[PDB]
Amino acid sequence: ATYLIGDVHGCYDELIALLHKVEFTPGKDTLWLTGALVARGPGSLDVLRYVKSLGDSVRLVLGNHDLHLLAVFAGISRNKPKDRLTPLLEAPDADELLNWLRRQPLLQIDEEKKLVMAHAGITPQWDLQTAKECARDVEAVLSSDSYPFFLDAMYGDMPNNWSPELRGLGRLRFITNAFTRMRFCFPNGQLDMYSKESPEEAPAPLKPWFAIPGPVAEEYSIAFGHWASLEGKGTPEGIYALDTGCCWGGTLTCLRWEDKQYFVQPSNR
Ligand SMILES: [Mn+2]
């Protein structure tokens, strides 16, 4: 079977309970994770240890809080007490864990299921070929020995309109924002990096990135996390918003792909 779970945010207990709910068996089943494995929740260390131990039985994409952890670790950015990342940063095996984490993809594609995964989704301004190229570039930087220079370069809210002519730092910033931070779009598909509310309560003319016809979403189903205020509701057919806000007191949501069956684990705090 194939299982997809949204943003875990250090919620190790809920993750293990939900996987036992569905009898997840490595070797016979596959797990897809929308990223943001760490922060806010109490068990970032345990979550990373376990996901890493799964080996090929998991398909992960990195989110913004994974990148932020990578940036704190490399001394690029400062530790926020609210993240609760200190046990993980101080662990004896922290090197193994984060060096593994930075090698993971931004994008997962399964051709047989016609299924795509990224932390925040796929901008309507990208076709599949372009999304693949951009994922490759950023993953190459992230897995290189010079990853802290990229992590430092990544912070930024511009440019927010994709063009194949973007070069250098602008191109990297836009890729990273599209994959890990995107929420609302302007009618031309340009990213808005400020609105974080639900679609009903957003200002005009902002529209959810998935409310805009794009080449990828016309041929593929898209699963994603990141946008908790969405609450997993109100998406069009073929769009799966799996982030139900576990670390915030919501739920951890798991979707079994074969029959599209949902399983939900209540938040412990
Ligand atoms: Mn999130």
What is the 221 CA–ligand 1 centroid distance (Å)?
20
148 in Cβ contact with 75 (< 8 Å): yes
Which structural technique was applied? X-ray
What residues have their beta carbon closer than 5 A to ion ligand 1? 7, 36, 226
Interior CA angle at 218 toward 213 and 222, to 5°?
95
Structure tokens, 219: 């041929």
Q: Where are the alpha helices (DSSP H) in the chain?
A: 12-21, 44-53, 64-73, 86-89, 94-101, 128-142, 147-154, 168-180, 215-219
126 in Cβ contact with 162 (< 8 Å): yes
What is the 102 CA–ligand 1 centroid distance (Å)?
18
Residue length of the chain: 269
Q: State the virtual CA torsion across 33, 146, 194, 47 in degrees, nearest 10.
A: 30
**Separation between Cα atoms, residue 149 and residue 2, nearest integer Å:** 36
Provide the domain count of the chain. 1
How many CB atoms neighbour CB 41 within 10 A? 28
Helices 64-73 and 168-180 meet at what angle, rounded to 10? 120
Specify the resolution in Å: 2.2
Closest CA to 84 of 36, 37, 35, 42: 42
What is the 39 CA–ligand 1 centroid distance (Å)?
9
213 in Cβ contact with 187 (< 8 Å): no
What is the 210 CA–ligand 1 centroid distance (Å)?
17
**Separation between Cα atoms, residue 60 and residue 57, nearest integer Å:** 10
Which residues, at least 6 apart from 69, have a Cβ–Cβ distance to it below 8 Å?
38, 39, 44, 83, 85, 88, 98, 101
**Separation between Cα atoms, residue 126 and residue 210, nearest integer Å:** 12
What is the 20 CA–ligand 1 centroid distance (Å)?
23
- Peptide bond before residue 42 is cis, with ω within 30 degrees of 0: no
Q: State the virtual CA torsion across 114, 115, 116, 121 in degrees, nearest 10.
A: 110
What is the 63 CA–ligand 1 centroid distance (Å)?
8
How many CB atoms neighbour CB 105 within 10 A? 20
255 in Cβ contact with 242 (< 8 Å): yes
What is the 84 CA–ligand 1 centroid distance (Å)?
15
What is the 201 CA–ligand 1 centroid distance (Å)?
19
Q: How many helices (H) and strands (E) does the chain have?
A: 9, 12
Q: Domain of 130?
A: 2-266
The domain spanning residue 46 has which CATH number? 3.60.21.10
**Separation between Cα atoms, residue 70 and residue 180, nearest integer Å:** 14
238 in Cβ contact with 222 (< 8 Å): yes
Backbone angles phi, psi at 55, to 5 degrees: 55, -135
How many CB atoms neighbour CB 213 within 10 A? 10
